[PDB]
Design a binder for this molecule. Structure first.
Ligand SMILES: *C(#N)N1[C][C][C][C](N2N=C(C3=[C][C]=C(OC4=[C][C]=C(F)[C]=C4F)[C]=[C]3)C(C([N])=O)=C2[N])[C]1
Length: 252
């Protein structure tokens, strides 16, 4: 639904992400909103605005909510839920936080709750990673940019299963594999997966079967969960419903 840009007030610069400039502001002084301004030529706009009608019908406490769009201008704006602590990759990298492993397992729980919701709606994320995850004033992790890789006009080699790398075979089981890499990202405190390798070198190793080592902060019970996401046989990989159950068991 077409938010009138007169309702919007811009107060803080939040920097740049996928498709460009992001800002913090208020809608009619009341609500805290994030405003993404779409850099021209970077997106398939008509296809996006069309999907945005169905993305607004989506709703989960751990999914960044879509307040609407401003597609009557040049450039077009996307209005969403305000996430004060920004990108999870930067939030994890800030060593001062002195995170407990229980805070890290709860980051996985959160994301997994958003992924179980998406999975049930048969909605694929296609680009699940800590860079597409946001953190709010309370330290909660919410899933963002769900399916935006479909409209983007540098590929996520480090989060891609072997069937995607050699054959481009996307499914629930591609998001499952990506989740496992994201669980590793969290426990490794924002470490770049397969950092010693280039995009092509990292892709070759994955196709052969090299898996991400156990991050020291992760217990064997934790590593078993993320390691079950990296099965060569996609059918052997659990669903987000199975993963969540396992996270909740380990929680205890
Ligand atoms: C990191 N570091 N970054 C880059 C700077 C901006 C920061 N930030 N971006 C947003 C944000 C993210 C996505 C938005 O638009 C969406 C969201 C979901 C979706 F499915 C489609 C879509 F277009 C809008 C704003 C926020 C924020 N929401 O607070 C922040 N902090 C992150």
């Amino acid at each position: 639904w077409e938010i009138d840009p007169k309702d919007l007030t811009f107060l803080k610069e939040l920097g740049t992400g996928q498709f460009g400039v992001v800002k913090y502001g208020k809608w009619r002084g009341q609500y805290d909103v994030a405003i993404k301004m779409i850099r021209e030529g970077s997106m398939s706009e008509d296809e996006f605005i069309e999907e945005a009608k169905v993305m607004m019908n989506l709703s989960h406490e751990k999914l960044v909510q879509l307040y609407g769009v401003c597609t009557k201008q040049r450039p077009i704006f996307i209005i969403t839920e305000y996430m004060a602590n920004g990108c999870l990759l930067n939030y994890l990298r800030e060593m001062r936080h002195r995170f407990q492993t229980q805070q890290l397992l709860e980051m996985c729980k959160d994301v997994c709750e958003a992924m179980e919701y998406l999975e049930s709606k048969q909605f694929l994320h296609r680009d699940l990673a800590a860079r597409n995850c946001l953190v709010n004033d309370q330290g909660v992790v919410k899933v963002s940019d769900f399916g935006l890789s479909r409209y983007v006009l540098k590929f996520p080699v480090r989060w891609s299963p072997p069937e995607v790398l050699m054959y481009s075979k996307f499914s629930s089981k591609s998001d499952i594999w990506a989740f496992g890499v994201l669980m590793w990202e969290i426990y490794s405190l924002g470490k770049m997966p397969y950092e010693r390798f280039t995009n092509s070198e990292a892709a070759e190793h994955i196709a052969q079967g090299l898996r991400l080592y156990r991050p020291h902060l992760a217990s064997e019970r934790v590593y078993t969960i993320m390691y079950s996401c990296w099965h060569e046989k996609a059918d052997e990989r659990p669903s987000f419903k199975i993963l969540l159950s396992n996270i909740l068991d380990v929680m205890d």
